[PDB]
């Protein structure tokens, strides 16, 4: 259910106040740490030498209460970007004082507003404070979904609210945040507390906040419609926004005073609770994928490295994938050997990379479902996995399965194969080097032989996630290129991100290859929003046999298949993409005798550097 807090700008007795909001049902409290109206002078006498105390004691709460329950708030008088030199200097000294007192109490987070376009000095003072010892504290930047200027009542006679649409103008609130976080150098301690007004803007304004680090969503009591009974509720479009925020797992803050006076304050929380308990309850894919969201992982190399026992275990339990592999064999057996030939014709069937033999089992089920005889070979290079097969061969299968403890590129076969069945695909189709492996195994396929899979195709899509860009940037390691982390792909269940164009195909491979494996592909992605490009999401589709396919391409995604998450190709420097412009990306598949690697560059609307030139940052071992 929903983790939620109360925003107050008035706290007479911190003891009574905090006891009341917890009784109301809130998990934490956003309050001032100095009285909001208590303006303080640091330069000019005699106000400079104002007798203390300057705020209320740290003794009034336990360190645990400060650590868990209290979010700080910058006093509203503090304006570091004032046009007055004196008010700037006071605000500078005042801001450091309030932030340093926040750090003293050990507050989990501290709220700072983005009220205006120019928050340059505010960013500088916060940046100064962040680089004052490595101290883990969050800074929630309060940004409105719509600026107060652009939702004001049309009641000023000689200055009317423009009755025209300014596409970029209505997104100015995002440029406030972008300019701020960019000045602060994408600090993981700086997140968005998005404030939601009575009337939502256009979706493109709301979509603008996808991939941004939203930690809190602020709901003023004013935006809640009253219903027949008297309870507070929200519009269908407000509910949509709340549902999207609950997926991002934000903390919901209630600001403003009670307007539904004939109700307890929990009435507002009760509705949020009711909402989050009445979201759609997916899924096959989602519930299995819960925990892996925006979590970066090195792409596995089952060729170069021997996969661990538990790794195998979790990927032989994907019934969709093996249902499809079973049916693929099922149909191939029928198409190859006729009915009258069923007892005479036995099909030499070879599983190339059999691991613990879920494809060997799939081949057996398919055989006595189609009612055709088969001779099995289980070729496996991983000698640890071969132990599992030979134990299973002796115990269960018998001489039907010949377990071969070899590399398929090396193995000199006794007889040629009717069907070669393989499982060597990665998140980006060919990134686990299925092409090179099957090419080396192709010579022992019969002249009229089938490969399962017959075909696979990789897909790319440009994405925006400042969140995922931060995660990559945080992967800098000692004793290598400082930017190496940007020049390598990550497997990741992309969650807080924005797909900026429809996925398009990158690289295709066919088996058998009746014709090299190096590739160069230029893609043009039409972008219909203002955004920031951080990298390219990679997916794949594969033709196992005829109409039986597997896909993690979101459009055509195989239902509830958890075998593959999408891959992410980052870029060093984010590229500003204005509405209408085209993202032109370039992808190479490069190789020598020893390594296979991807190189990539953006050529529009701006040129990026060529990423991973000569595989200097990332190679896949042959």
């Amino acid at each position: 259910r929903v983790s939620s807090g109360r925003d107050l700008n008035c706290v007479p007795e911190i003891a009574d106040t905090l006891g009341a909001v917890a009784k109301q049902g809130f998990d934490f409290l956003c309050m001032p740490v100095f009285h909001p109206r208590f303006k303080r002078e640091f330069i000019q006498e005699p106000a400079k030498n104002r007798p203390g105390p300057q705020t209320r004691s740290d003794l009034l709460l336990s360190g645990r209460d400060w650590n868990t329950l209290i979010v700080g708030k910058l006093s509203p008088w503090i304006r570091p970007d004032s046009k007055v030199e004196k008010i700037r200097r006071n605000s500078e000294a005042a801001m450091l004082q309030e932030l340093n007192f926040g750090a003293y109490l050990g507050l989990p987070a501290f709220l700072l507003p983005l009220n205006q376009e120019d928050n340059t000095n505010l960013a500088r003072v916060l940046t100064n404070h962040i680089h004052t010892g490595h101290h883990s504290s969050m800074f929630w930047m309060r940004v409105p979904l719509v600026a107060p200027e652009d939702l004001r009542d049309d009641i000023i006679e000689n200055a009317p609210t423009t009755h025209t649409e300014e596409y970029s103008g209505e997104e100015k609130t995002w440029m406030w945040w972008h300019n701020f976080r960019t000045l602060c150098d994408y600090s993981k301690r700086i997140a968005v507390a998005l404030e939601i007004g009575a009337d939502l803007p256009s979706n493109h304004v709301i979509d603008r906040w996808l991939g941004e680090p939203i930690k809190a969503a602020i709901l003023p009591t004013s935006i809640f419609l009253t219903n027949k009974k008297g309870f507070p509720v929200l519009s269908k479009m407000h509910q949509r926004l709340i549902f999207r925020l609950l997926k991002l797992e934000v903390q919901f803050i209630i600001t403003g005073t009670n307007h539904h006076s004939e109700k307890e304050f929990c009435s507002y929380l009760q509705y949020l609770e009711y909402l989050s308990q009445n979201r759609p309850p997916p899924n096959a894919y989602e519930l299995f994928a819960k925990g892996y969201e925006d979590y970066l992982q090195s792409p596995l190399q089952p060729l170069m490295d021997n996969l661990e026992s538990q790794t195998y275990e979790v990927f032989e339990k994907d019934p969709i994938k093996y249902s499809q592999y079973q049916q693929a064999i099922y149909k191939c057996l029928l198409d190859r050997v006729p009915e009258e030939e069923k007892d005479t014709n036995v099909q030499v069937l070879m599983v190339l990379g059999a691991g613990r033999g879920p494809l060997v089992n799939a081949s057996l089920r398919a055989a006595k479902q189609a009612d055709r005889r088969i001779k099995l070979y289980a070729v496996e290079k991983n000698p640890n996995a071969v132990v599992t097969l030979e134990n299973w061969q002796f115990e269960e299968w018998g001489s039907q399965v010949t377990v071969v403890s070899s590399d398929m590129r090396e193995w000199v076969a006794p007889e040629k194969a009717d069907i070669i069945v393989s499982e060597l695909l990665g998140s980006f189709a060919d990134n686990e080097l299925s092409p090179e492996c099957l090419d080396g195994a192709q010579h022992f396929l019969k002249d009229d032989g089938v490969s399962i899979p017959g075909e696979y195709t990789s897909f790319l899509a440009p994405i925006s996630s400042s969140k995922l860009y931060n995660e990559v940037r945080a992967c800098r390691e000692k004793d290598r290129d400082p930017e190496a982390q940007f020049e390598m792909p990550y497997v990741v269940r992309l969650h807080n991100f924005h797909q900026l164009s429809a996925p398009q195909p990158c690289f295709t491979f066919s088996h058998p290859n009746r014709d090299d494996n190096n590739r160069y592909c230029t893609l043009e992605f039409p972008v219909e929003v203002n955004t920031v490009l951080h990298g390219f999401a990679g997916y794949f589709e594969t033709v196992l046999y005829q109409d039986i396919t597997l896909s993690i391409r979101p459009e055509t995604h195989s239902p509830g298949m958890f075998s593959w998450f999408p891959i992410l190709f980052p870029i060093k420097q984010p590229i500003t993409v204005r509405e209408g412009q085209t993202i032109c990306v370039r992808f190479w598949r490069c190789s020598n005798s020893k390594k296979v690697w991807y190189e990539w560059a953006v050529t529009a609307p701006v040129c990026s550097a060529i990423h991973n030139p000569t595989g200097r940052s990332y190679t896949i071992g042959l």
């Binding site: 109206r37 303006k39 106000a47 009542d153 000023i156």
Partner: protein, 301 residues
């Protein structure tokens, strides 16, 4: 409470003091009445007093026995002075604003008032019915000051950190009108109507400049650098040809002529000067209160 916010002389010559705790364990407020003005601030020599649940940001007399308060809580509350004037009791305390109520002003009738909150909204009140008539979100930032027209209910001034001074006329379908100097100068903070010209006012900015404005001419006739820091209050004298008292965060009082020339200045305060009120009994006597808990009584030459 150490920090004094408001100080207003009643017709008969009694002194109303609004106060708040802006530091310490408790952050509440209080309202006092002093029938002996040379006794203040000393609590031990007062006529009546009461504690509010939260601090007071601004205060106004509603006639003779009424006290309208702008609370930190986000409430506008009306406290009633007793039949003996020895007890102050709450009539209405209405939580209608979503942030600190920072300014209040009673309209010429005395049956209605307008408030200005940090939630950016201006609201018009019916003190008889204790409900809100109008709710105006005109500004784009904290509503700093709202000053009622001396002689017109439908008219009043307001200024905000959006750098707008709005002349209001609720008779109009678009009640607000932006009015000020040629160029967009420093932010307006204090507003005082001229008592004899219904169409001119003075606005003090955050840079310490006090400016004389004509609504009719829509151009600033004369300004002057009075204070070194922000102008927090502007109050006219009851004189036939009135003096202008200007308050500031530079902890200095100044009293000016019709052309904003310096006639008097006091460095008596050691903290910020919050409110000033002229003696109705002795027009040469001006009373200030500050956050230094001082109630200084000035003789003006």
């Amino acid at each position: 409470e150490r920090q004094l916010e408001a100080a207003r002389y009643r017709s008969d010559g009694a002194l109303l003091l609004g106060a708040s705790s802006l530091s310490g364990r408790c952050w509440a407020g209080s309202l006092w009445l002093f029938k002996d003005p040379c006794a203040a601030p000393n609590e031990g020599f007062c006529s009546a007093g009461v504690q509010t649940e939260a601090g007071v940001a601004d205060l106004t007399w509603v006639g003779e026995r009424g006290i309208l308060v702008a609370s930190d809580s986000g409430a506008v509350e009306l406290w009633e002075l007793d039949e003996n004037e020895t007890l102050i009791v709450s009539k209405f305390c209405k939580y209608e604003h979503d942030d600190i109520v920072s300014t209040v002003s009673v309209l010429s009738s005395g049956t209605q008032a307008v408030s200005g909150s940090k939630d950016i909204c201006i609201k018009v009140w019916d003190l008889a019915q204790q409900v809100v008539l109008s709710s105006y979100r005109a500004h784009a930032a904290q509503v700093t000051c709202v000053a009622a027209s001396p002689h017109k209910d439908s008219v009043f001034l307001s200024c905000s950190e959006d750098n707008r001074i709005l002349l209001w006329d609720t008779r109009c379908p678009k009640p607000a009108s932006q009015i000020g100097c040629s160029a967009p100068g420093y932010l307006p903070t204090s507003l005082a109507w001229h008592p004899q010209q219904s169409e001119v006012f003075v606005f003090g900015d955050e840079n310490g400049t006090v400016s004389l404005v004509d609504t009719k001419s829509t151009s600033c006739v004369l300004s002057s650098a009075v204070h070194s820091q922000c102008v927090t209050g502007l109050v006219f004298s009851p004189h036939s040809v009135p003096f202008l008292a200007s308050l500031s965060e530079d902890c200095s009082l100044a009293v000016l002529d019709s052309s904003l020339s310096e006639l008097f200045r006091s460095q008596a305060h050691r903290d910020f000067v919050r409110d000033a009120t002229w003696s109705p009994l002795n027009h040469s006597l001006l009373t200030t209160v500050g956050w230094d808990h001082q109630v200084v009584h000035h003789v003006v030459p």
